[PDB]
Design a protein around this motif. Structure first.
Motif, PDB file in Angstrom:
ATOM      1  N   UNK A  77       1.563   1.885  -3.385  1.00 44.41           N
ATOM      2  CA  UNK A  77       0.165   1.992  -2.873  1.00 44.41           C
ATOM      3  C   UNK A  77      -0.722   1.080  -3.717  1.00 44.41           C
ATOM      4  N   UNK A  78      -0.392   0.993  -5.011  1.00 43.22           N
ATOM      5  CA  UNK A  78      -0.986   0.099  -6.042  1.00 43.22           C
ATOM      6  C   UNK A  78      -1.190  -1.323  -5.519  1.00 43.22           C
ATOM      7  N   UNK A  79      -0.149  -1.914  -4.920  1.00 40.88           N
ATOM      8  CA  UNK A  79      -0.114  -3.341  -4.496  1.00 40.88           C
ATOM      9  C   UNK A  79      -0.218  -3.491  -2.972  1.00 40.88           C
ATOM     10  N   UNK A  80      -0.179  -2.389  -2.212  1.00 38.97           N
ATOM     11  CA  UNK A  80      -0.234  -2.386  -0.725  1.00 38.97           C
ATOM     12  C   UNK A  80      -1.412  -1.528  -0.283  1.00 38.97           C
ATOM     13  N   UNK A  81      -2.608  -2.097  -0.368  1.00 43.35           N
ATOM     14  CA  UNK A  81      -3.879  -1.382  -0.117  1.00 43.35           C
ATOM     15  C   UNK A  81      -4.058  -1.185   1.388  1.00 43.35           C
ATOM     16  N   UNK A  82      -3.739  -2.212   2.189  1.00 46.08           N
ATOM     17  CA  UNK A  82      -4.047  -2.271   3.647  1.00 46.08           C
ATOM     18  C   UNK A  82      -3.221  -1.250   4.429  1.00 46.08           C
ATOM     19  N   UNK A  83      -2.079  -0.820   3.915  1.00 47.74           N
ATOM     20  CA  UNK A  83      -1.105   0.039   4.650  1.00 47.74           C
ATOM     21  C   UNK A  83      -1.706   1.418   4.899  1.00 47.74           C
ATOM     22  N   UNK A 101       8.417  -2.267  12.791  1.00 45.48           N
ATOM     23  CA  UNK A 101       7.092  -2.086  12.142  1.00 45.48           C
ATOM     24  C   UNK A 101       7.282  -1.402  10.777  1.00 45.48           C
ATOM     25  N   UNK A 102       8.016  -0.295  10.779  1.00 44.04           N
ATOM     26  CA  UNK A 102       8.306   0.571   9.609  1.00 44.04           C
ATOM     27  C   UNK A 102       8.911  -0.260   8.484  1.00 44.04           C
ATOM     28  N   UNK A 103       9.800  -1.219   8.813  1.00 38.16           N
ATOM     29  CA  UNK A 103      10.516  -2.114   7.865  1.00 38.16           C
ATOM     30  C   UNK A 103       9.580  -3.001   7.058  1.00 38.16           C
ATOM     31  N   UNK A 104       8.387  -3.279   7.565  1.00 36.79           N
ATOM     32  CA  UNK A 104       7.424  -4.187   6.887  1.00 36.79           C
ATOM     33  C   UNK A 104       6.681  -3.423   5.787  1.00 36.79           C
ATOM     34  N   UNK A 105       6.742  -2.079   5.802  1.00 37.33           N
ATOM     35  CA  UNK A 105       6.000  -1.146   4.911  1.00 37.33           C
ATOM     36  C   UNK A 105       6.901  -0.531   3.833  1.00 37.33           C
ATOM     37  N   UNK A 106       6.363  -0.397   2.608  1.00 33.12           N
ATOM     38  CA  UNK A 106       6.869   0.474   1.521  1.00 33.12           C
ATOM     39  C   UNK A 106       6.460   1.942   1.717  1.00 33.12           C
ATOM     40  N   UNK A 107       7.138   2.929   1.114  1.00 31.87           N
ATOM     41  CA  UNK A 107       6.779   4.376   1.199  1.00 31.87           C
ATOM     42  C   UNK A 107       5.843   4.761   0.037  1.00 31.87           C
ATOM     43  N   UNK A 108       5.897   4.023  -1.067  1.00 31.67           N
ATOM     44  CA  UNK A 108       5.010   4.174  -2.241  1.00 31.67           C
ATOM     45  C   UNK A 108       4.352   2.799  -2.391  1.00 31.67           C
ATOM     46  N   UNK A 157       9.313  -0.060  -2.098  1.00 33.53           N
ATOM     47  CA  UNK A 157       8.710  -1.417  -1.973  1.00 33.53           C
ATOM     48  C   UNK A 157       8.883  -1.970  -0.546  1.00 33.53           C
ATOM     49  N   UNK A 158      10.025  -1.722   0.099  1.00 33.92           N
ATOM     50  CA  UNK A 158      10.361  -2.274   1.443  1.00 33.92           C
ATOM     51  C   UNK A 158      11.415  -1.420   2.160  1.00 33.92           C
ATOM     52  N   UNK A 159      11.047  -0.747   3.240  1.00 33.90           N
ATOM     53  CA  UNK A 159      12.011   0.058   4.043  1.00 33.90           C
ATOM     54  C   UNK A 159      13.044  -0.868   4.692  1.00 33.90           C
ATOM     55  N   UNK A 160      12.633  -2.080   5.057  1.00 32.79           N
ATOM     56  CA  UNK A 160      13.545  -3.066   5.648  1.00 32.79           C
ATOM     57  C   UNK A 160      14.737  -3.278   4.726  1.00 32.79           C
ATOM     58  N   UNK A 193       5.129   6.488   9.593  1.00 33.65           N
ATOM     59  CA  UNK A 193       6.424   7.117   9.225  1.00 33.65           C
ATOM     60  C   UNK A 193       6.668   8.384  10.036  1.00 33.65           C
ATOM     61  N   UNK A 194       5.647   9.179  10.320  1.00 31.47           N
ATOM     62  CA  UNK A 194       5.889  10.440  11.069  1.00 31.47           C
ATOM     63  C   UNK A 194       5.933  10.163  12.580  1.00 31.47           C
ATOM     64  N   UNK A 195       5.366   9.046  13.040  1.00 25.76           N
ATOM     65  CA  UNK A 195       5.405   8.621  14.452  1.00 25.76           C
ATOM     66  C   UNK A 195       6.864   8.287  14.805  1.00 25.76           C
ATOM     67  N   UNK A 196       7.482   7.439  13.965  1.00 25.88           N
ATOM     68  CA  UNK A 196       8.930   7.098  13.939  1.00 25.88           C
ATOM     69  C   UNK A 196       9.749   8.390  14.007  1.00 25.88           C
ATOM     70  N   UNK A 197       9.563   9.283  13.023  1.00 28.26           N
ATOM     71  CA  UNK A 197      10.293  10.579  12.931  1.00 28.26           C
ATOM     72  C   UNK A 197      10.198  11.342  14.252  1.00 28.26           C
ATOM     73  N   UNK A 198       9.013  11.329  14.869  1.00 24.44           N
ATOM     74  CA  UNK A 198       8.723  12.059  16.130  1.00 24.44           C
ATOM     75  C   UNK A 198       9.639  11.479  17.211  1.00 24.44           C
ATOM     76  N   UNK A 199       9.793  10.144  17.245  1.00 26.17           N
ATOM     77  CA  UNK A 199      10.625   9.409  18.251  1.00 26.17           C
ATOM     78  C   UNK A 199      12.132   9.672  18.039  1.00 26.17           C
TER      79      UNK A 199
END
Length: 423
Positions: free
Chosen positions: A130-136, A121-128, A351-354, A150-156
């Motif tokens: 925000x400009x071009x990734x409104x839905x995240x 799931x995390x791989x489909x998302x950028x960390x910044x 842009x992409x954690x993946x 990102x913090x749910x992942x960290x918790x695991x």
């Protein structure tokens, strides 16, 4: 018009990767446009079973289909591939808000305690971005305990979960096998064809006794190149010594690509033709792409080209990265790429954690810059500099090293791998 979705994939039945390949086709035909694929994960069972291990992934795309319409296309794909059930498709996210129905909890509370769901799931998302990734921003807010996905992942356990004594491993699919390019450093030996067939085989036989993992065969005119490469490709591929060894081939000519894949090339290494994306799409071969403010420049430059490649049907889970050391006409830039490899990954992660987790190949071997720095104008005199450079790059995260001198760089890889072992 179009609502953004994220769908999870899971399979421990049949050729697990064929199921994912098939699902991706039937998703296209039945009105799902996939924009981003996750890395591939192979999950260990958390209880005693004789069942095969699961392959877990996730995709992100746009669809006209409404929730119940979408769910029914997934249920359709599931039954249609089934004539036990081979493939699980699950809606993780639909649009911006939580859906509830008889059986349609989107996002289900289970996803924040399942590493094989959260990692992809995390791989489909950028960390910044925000400009071009409104839905995240919305998906982040649907997390049960705040701080985003990102913090749910960290918790695991976050990335700590993958590696030595890992529950789950990032894997690259090559035909019928899965390769964990993070478990050790893989050494790719250069076999150049313009410095014949009998010399090539004895070169390879030598690389193999020196500890090599992968043979890079690289040869301009579309037929000249077929004529030089394919014969030795055929021979090297048949060698008894080459059983369970990979062959990359270095070309920009789609027709050479197609002929090389057909003749036993395992990895296709492009350096740059819109025909190419099509050749690599029909095939099941990893696609290594080369790069053409240095960290940010390389990251985004690479990202743009991976986005292009995903959109043309090439998942990110079989895409590999070379930041292109020793094409830059200058010392300072080459040193940066090696020493700032983790920083390039942060910039990619934005842009992409993946893409930040995609395996990285560096090729510093006897490049001019080692010459200028060490006073070695003869390429062949630049091996000690290459061992040093390759040791730095592995310490800064490189997974594959492209080398001339196999034995000396293998000694360095084996030592780096022992040194970076957590103990």
């Amino acid at each position: 018009t179009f609502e953004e979705v994220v769908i999870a994939l899971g399979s421990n039945v049949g050729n697990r990767m064929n199921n994912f390949k098939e699902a991706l086709r039937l998703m296209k035909d039945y009105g799902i446009s996939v924009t981003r694929h996750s890395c591939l994960y192979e999950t260990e069972p958390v209880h005693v079973t004789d069942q095969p291990r699961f392959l877990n992934a996730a995709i992100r795309g746009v669809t006209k289909l409404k929730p119940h319409e979408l769910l029914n296309v997934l249920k359709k794909i599931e039954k249609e591939m089934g004539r036990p059930r081979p493939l699980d498709l699950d809606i993780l996210f639909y649009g911006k808000h939580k859906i509830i129905s008889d059986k349609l909890i989107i996002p289900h509370e289970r996803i924040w305690e399942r590493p094989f769901v959260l990692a992809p799931l995390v791989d489909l998302l950028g960390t910044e971005d925000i400009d071009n990734d409104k839905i995240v921003a919305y998906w982040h807010s649907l997390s049960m305990h705040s701080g985003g996905i990102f913090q749910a992942w960290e918790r695991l356990g976050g990335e700590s979960l993958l590696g030595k004594d890992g529950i789950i491993q990032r894997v690259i699919p090559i035909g019928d096998h899965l390769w964990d390019f993070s478990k050790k450093t893989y050494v790719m030996g250069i076999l150049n064809l313009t410095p014949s067939v009998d010399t090539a085989v004895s070169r390879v036989r030598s690389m193999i006794s020196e500890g090599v993992d992968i043979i890079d065969i690289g040869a301009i005119s579309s037929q000249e190149e077929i004529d030089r490469l394919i014969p030795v490709l055929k021979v090297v591929r048949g060698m008894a010594e080459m059983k369970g060894k990979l062959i990359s081939v270095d070309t920009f000519n789609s027709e050479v690509a197609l002929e090389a894949i057909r003749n036993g090339a395992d990895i296709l290494n492009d350096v740059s033709d819109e025909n190419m994306h099509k050749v690599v799409a029909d095939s099941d071969v990893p696609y290594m792409i080369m790069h053409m403010e240095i960290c940010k420049d390389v990251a985004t430059e690479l990202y743009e080209r991976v986005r292009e490649a995903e959109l043309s049907g090439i998942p990110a889970w079989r895409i590999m990265i070379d930041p292109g050391i020793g094409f830059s006409k200058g010392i300072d830039h080459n040193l940066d790429i090696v020493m700032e490899l983790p920083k390039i990954r942060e910039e990619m992660a934005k842009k992409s954690i993946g893409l930040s987790h995609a395996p990285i190949l560096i090729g510093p071997s006897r490049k001019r810059f080692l010459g200028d720095i060490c006073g070695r104008p003869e390429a062949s005199e630049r091996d000690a500099a290459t061992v040093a450079c390759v040791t730095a790059g592995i310490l800064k995260g490189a997974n594959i090293i492209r080398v001339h001198n196999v034995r000396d760089n293998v000694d360095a890889a084996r030592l780096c791998d022992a040194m970076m072992t957590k103990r």
